[PDB]
Design a protein around this ligand. Structure first.
Ligand code: UQS
Length: 435
């Protein structure tokens, strides 16, 4: 695996021991060969599990998710996918890693896709080696891969709203269920219906994942209601998955706005990862996977792959050269390499809008490419009437930094800034000049 110009896809089935068995063996061999190595975890939760699995090896944990004193001598760095891409974008020195290991390498967040593009380009140039660890590599067509124990697969109508009758199988279960929903708002409604029926429900999504995931360990629960974030190495002691087989797809319409299309079918890779939360214990056969629709390759035209090009266009590789997307996922976007390359000052603005601003890549790009400075929030108020953001069916309102009450009406409308109450609260604070 460790020879220059090699990219290895470590595609053992879910729970085959890629993280707990194979990764420490790879790391021991890398230190032996004096290979400067990076290990990319999808989430802080996974970074912490890796620290436990690599305990006793010289690894620098570039995450506050791990409280450990470093020797100062480590040639192996461990950080989140997003942290890798973030450091490449910033005027911060990132070493030339000889070996690039990405765990949960199916992750379709823009920063993960960009990290794969950068790494796979370095390998294709003959500059480095890489290992992508995932049961479900890009373009996989198998929603039903092997497992540690036999799984009971059942195609069944799954509720996507509160229900009063007709789904007794859902609540009649006495074990623990992980239930994949397409959105936070859809999970809230299902969670409330289960709570009313006497169930203990934990809800997970991207913004709450680190905090809430700990509850699955510290308290008893009947259901976990989760978005697609639990596809990225989240482990549960569960015996059933309920899978809507539905997701939302961000779509850029007419180059001018982002909508959240769907819900629509998940990819085969997503379905396999959702299913792969169970069947993990060889001593407990007959875990259940109930699934409520088909799969389709909905990553085609999905805004994350265009956002990944925006990130890679703004990352230095070699003189004018720009990293390509990893070949198997490179057709998911119709884009010109370099089309999103910003001049130094607009790139700095782009970075700050993502990092401090917490804006979606697409929206950060529109603002930075328009020549707007990070603190200039006039654009949050001067859009067309149909860009009005609504809150409880009235136009949303904030007090500007000038102390004026104004309707939130952004010049560029990205549905992700108001997809739930927490998102819209964050965007209101942004529009108000509070960060
Ligand atoms: F009530 C005010 C007086 C002066 C400036 C602003 C406000 C409103 N609150 C706010 C919005 N952004 N930052 C602060």
């Amino acid at each position: 695996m460790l020879k220059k110009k090699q990219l290895t896809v470590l595609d053992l089935h879910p729970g085959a021991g890629k993280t707990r068995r194979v990764l420490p063996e790879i790391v021991r061999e890398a230190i032996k060969k004096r290979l400067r190595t990076v290990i990319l975890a999808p989430t802080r939760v996974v970074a912490a599990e890796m620290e436990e699995a690599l305990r006793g090896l010289p690894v620098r944990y570039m995450t506050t998710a791990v409280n450990v004193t470093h020797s100062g001598t480590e040639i192996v760095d461990l950080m989140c996918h997003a942290t890798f891409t973030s450091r490449l974008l910033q005027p911060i020195r990132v070493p030339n890693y000889n070996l690039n290991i990405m765990d949960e390498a199916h992750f379709t967040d823009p920063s993960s896709i960009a990290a794969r593009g950068y790494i796979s380009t370095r390998v294709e140039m003959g500059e480095a080696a890489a290992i992508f660890m995932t049961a479900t590599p890009p373009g996989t067509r198998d929603a039903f891969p092997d497992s540690n124990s036999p799984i009971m697969d059942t195609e069944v109508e799954v509720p996507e709203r509160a229900w009063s009758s007709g789904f007794d199988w859902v609540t009649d279960h006495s074990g623990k269920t992980v239930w994949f929903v397409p959105s936070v708002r859809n999970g809230n409604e299902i969670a409330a219906c289960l709570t009313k029926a006497g169930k203990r429900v934990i809800q997970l999504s991207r913004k709450t994942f680190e905090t809430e995931f700990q509850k699955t360990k510290n308290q008893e629960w009947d259901f976990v209601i989760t978005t697609d974030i639990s596809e990225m190495g989240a482990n549960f002691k569960a015996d059933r998955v309920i899978d809507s087989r539905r997701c939302l797809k961000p779509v850029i319409l007419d180059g001018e706005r982002v909508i959240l299309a769907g819900p629509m079918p998940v990819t085969h890779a997503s379905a396999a990862q959702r299913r792969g939360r169970i069947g993990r214990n060889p001593n407990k056969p007959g875990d259940e996977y109930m699934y409520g629709g088909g799969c389709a390759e909905t990553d085609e035209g999905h805004a994350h792959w265009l956002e990944a090009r925006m990130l890679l266009d703004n990352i230095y590789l070699q003189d004018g050269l720009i990293a390509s997307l990893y070949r198997p996922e490179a057709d998911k976007v119709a884009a010109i390499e370099g089309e999103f390359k910003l001049r130094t000052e607009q790139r700095k603005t782009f970075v700050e809008l993502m990092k401090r601003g917490d804006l979606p890549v697409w929206l950060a790009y529109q603002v930075a490419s328009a020549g707007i400075t990070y603190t200039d929030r006039r654009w949050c108020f001067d859009g067309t009437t149909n860009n009005t953001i609504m809150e409880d069916s009235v136009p949303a309102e904030v007090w500007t930094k000038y102390g004026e009450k104004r309707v939130l009406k952004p010049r560029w409308m990205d549905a992700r800034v108001c997809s739930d109450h927490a998102a819209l609260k964050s965007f209101k604070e942004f529009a108000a000049g509070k960060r």
